[PDB]
Amino acid sequence: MKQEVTQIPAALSVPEGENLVLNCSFTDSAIYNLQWFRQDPGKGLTSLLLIQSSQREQTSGRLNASLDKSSGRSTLYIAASQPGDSATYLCAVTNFNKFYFGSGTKLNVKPNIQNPDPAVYQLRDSKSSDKSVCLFTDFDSQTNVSQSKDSDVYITDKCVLDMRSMDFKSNSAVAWSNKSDFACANAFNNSIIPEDTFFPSP
Amino acid sequence: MKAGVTQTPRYLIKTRGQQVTLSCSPISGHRSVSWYQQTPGQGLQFLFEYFSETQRNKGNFPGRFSGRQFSNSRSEMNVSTLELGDSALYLCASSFDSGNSPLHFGNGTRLTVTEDLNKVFPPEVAVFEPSEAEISHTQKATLVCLATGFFPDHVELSWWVNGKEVHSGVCTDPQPLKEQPALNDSRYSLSSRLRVSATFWQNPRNHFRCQVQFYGLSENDEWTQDRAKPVTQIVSAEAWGRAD
């Protein structure tokens, strides 16, 4: 029989502090062990838990995983999620003479922004660059950033920075272009942004 | 601080039909060494595992993917007759015993297989200085770094303030964007932010640098284009604080 490892959900994006549930399922119950790993972008994998075929669960800190070998299932519980939990989580099983990895759950744990102050700022022109750059910043984590209608306007997704000595975190997205009919007033027009977003004069 | 799993080389660019040999050194005391291919489309896929100089297990790759292990437990893998779809992160994992002990992974060899080395471009890098409206409204100041026009995606971006590497106040996109989303050879762009206090930005003695390491062509790769050969290089941009 042919081993197939399934993980759901494919992607999960939740507010910090919530508990999380990651599911793994395998069609062939003749396994030696099941392992859970995390992977950050641009890095290798880190082992979180290894559950031997004779064991029903393993715990490490905020992580607890069950194994129901006859049912072909493991569930990873992450308590009280933190931003630093954001990663791809992989389920793997070791079979007699083969090793199989699931396709992963991509987890994003969003910060709770204490004092939203949404704004779109125009950054200064670079004397080396011919791009114009706009910064949408300080919005709360419920805001979704969309791509531009325009194929020559580039927009990133929200990225969270942490100013730890100030007890302060903030979301931002960057838009840029080198076309001339481009301005920061219009850059995020394809996104639903807060009605109170500050657009400073130039 | 003990060494983790090590892999060499970190980055490779090859053309179709060529061959590569990759090396992995396990953690000291680990004797099981496993290789895996990670791609966007197929995820992690097992190649083969070695213990005490012999292959113990194997995946389903064709015979142009091969491996071996030396008496000190170091392992090499080789791929012949390279194709575009062999572009992947080739990951090594070591373990004391893969049946009952955790896998410890290295950070991989990033291989890009391309049609033609004239598709390879280094990044352009620019720093954009903060908005004065941001400074007056928030008493904070966000610098942006853009790394644009590069191929393949073999870059590492970092920020340095007065010569010291910073992580506080930084966020770099987790992945680059394709500048032409429909094309296999599209060049890439990447953005990063560094936010400081307005007071810190206002000191003209403070120096800010955005560093991008690009891993490119080898001295042995032929080059006959007019433009500069896109060798491994750092491309950087900088700014100084200003009072007004």
Automatic annotation (TrEMBL), chain A:
Disulfide bonds join C134-C184. It comes from the Eukaryota. It is found in: Cell membrane. Alpha-beta TR is a heterodimer composed of an alpha and beta chain; disulfide-linked. The alpha-beta TR is associated with the transmembrane signaling CD3 coreceptor proteins to form the TR-CD3 (TcR or TCR). The assembly of alpha-beta TR heterodimers with CD3 occurs in the endoplasmic reticulum where a single alpha-beta TR heterodimer associates with one CD3D-CD3E heterodimer, one CD3G-CD3E heterodimer and one CD247 homodimer forming a stable octameric structure. CD3D-CD3E and CD3G-CD3E heterodimers preferentially associate with TR alpha and TR beta chains, respectively. This is TRA@ protein. It comes from Homo sapiens.
